[model samples]
Target: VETFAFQAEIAQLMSLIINTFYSNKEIFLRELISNSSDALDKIRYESLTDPSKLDSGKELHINLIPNKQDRTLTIVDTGIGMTKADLINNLGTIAKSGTKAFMEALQAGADISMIGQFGVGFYSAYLVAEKVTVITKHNDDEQYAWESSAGGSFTVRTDTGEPMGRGTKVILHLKEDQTEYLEERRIKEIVKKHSQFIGYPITLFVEK
Candidate 1:
């Protein structure tokens, strides 16, 4: 894993990215679940060499949970996850990402829409959240959590959420301005619109 640093110009670009151009915020759910599907596809392909990557025949899928009780929306997936270090280095900064190679493949004459294009999708959660928590378990390692408010920096720690079989779970604590995302109708509509053809199943959390 190569570590990275963001040049001054890149930092300037990132500030603009995190603060502006959120006009299409609802589309973030589409981008995220799509990215999750893409992660499953990557590991599924790699399973040809390391069959252990596919365990218990858990079909690849994305789960979206809107917790009315907690006023939160969570997006979980049975896909690739990040380690504690990966969570910080990737989410806390501007340029470094474990998904960089996958992103490059998309740029290098690939379909460019198979699910992923950039690491910025994770940050999109901030458009609708006051805080976002990513709980993840990688096949090669134990579980961990990534926390961010999208102000300037993020935090990474060991997992403290439910025991998912594998992959990541993102919990978005809704903000007053972004509370519409907590509605089942809104979340489901976004999924169906951008990801109905997604290569995996998508389920939602409805009841409080």
Candidate 2:
């Protein structure tokens, strides 16, 4: 397993967002689903001329699996997955102008609509999860597992579990104080409130 530390700039950025930005913690669900929708659109658009990039038998959709017993919630989408390099570049740094702008606005206490715009919405998982595990398979790269605890660093390595085929699976190990996200009804409500019209179907798996 390879490990890398997030830049000090990124650490500062994340601290700001997690500490004061989101009033409604449920907003994390919306942000995550919205990002998933965008990824789905990307893959679908690319597949128009290059169908080989798609995993056969897999349709575009998001799956939410809330497990009360394990205190975990898994969000899965058959969207475009990231390569190892993509994972590091995308998640490890604030590489975009929009993100830099957002950070500035956040520090200035300006009203901002920058949640999902700069690709930092993925960090919202830290608001509810003690640890986040991502297993993904990209069309042009080998599958990989990325794990972090909202710490200063993250670990990445080959995925040895069941293959994702194509897409990302984010497993959130819920924090003790935020276990309500493990409830099916709560997740459904959040999805309905924020992702009902996301252009892709969102499925919630509930065990009776």
Candidate 3:
């Protein structure tokens, strides 16, 4: 198990995002689903030559599981899962050059769309979730869980529990005032507006 602290710049940026992205909360769903789609495409592209690198028989799709009993919304995908180093770099730090790029753009008064270019769009989850857990399995690395409450740091550990098989799962614990995200109609509208053109299918399943 290992823990890492976010850089001061990253921490400040996170605070800014959480404080300002309130009205566009639903945009988080679009960003997450888009990210999942990209990961799936990446793994598929890699398998074109090194076929063995692919996750065995994993379907290519995104799944949204909303558990009202626990007040959790889980978004998962059969995609290019991240190794431990990848997790540390992406989730721990600002993710390669994405961080600096985002910082520069923001300083220059670039539009918010610049975040998508840097791929830090994942942080948008904090707009609605108090905490986020990432359970992922990479083709080259063991399974692990990365968790944080959008604080200055996050923790990662080997997950000997659930057999994720391959890919990643992001579980979001909704903020107290953000329960509207749990509604089926609300989610459906957001999906229709933002992710309708995603290359793969997106399904929301809630246990009755």
Q: In lDDT terms, which candidate is top?
A: 3
lDDT of each: 0.67, 0.79, 0.82
Models ranked on TM-score = 2, 3, 1
Model 1: per-residue Cα lDDT at residue 56:
30
lDDT of 2 by residue, 145-202 (tens): 9988855788899998997788888999988989889887888888888778889888
Residues 36-94, model 3: lDDT tens digits: 99899998888898888664544788999888878888999989888998888745454
The RMSD of every model to the true structure, in order and in angstroms, is: 5.8, 2.1, 2.1
In model 3, the worst 10-residue window by lDDT is 90-99
Q: TM-score for each prediction?
A: 0.77, 0.90, 0.90
Clashes of 3: 0
In candidate 1, what are the lDDT values of residues 59-97, reduced to their tens digit? Answer: 788888887768888888888776766665544354445
At residue 185, give the lDDT of candidate 1.
85
Q: Which lDDT value does model 1 have at 145? A: 76
Q: What is the number of residue pairs that collide in model 2?
A: 0
Candidate 1: segments with Cα more than 4 A from true spot: 1-14, 90-119
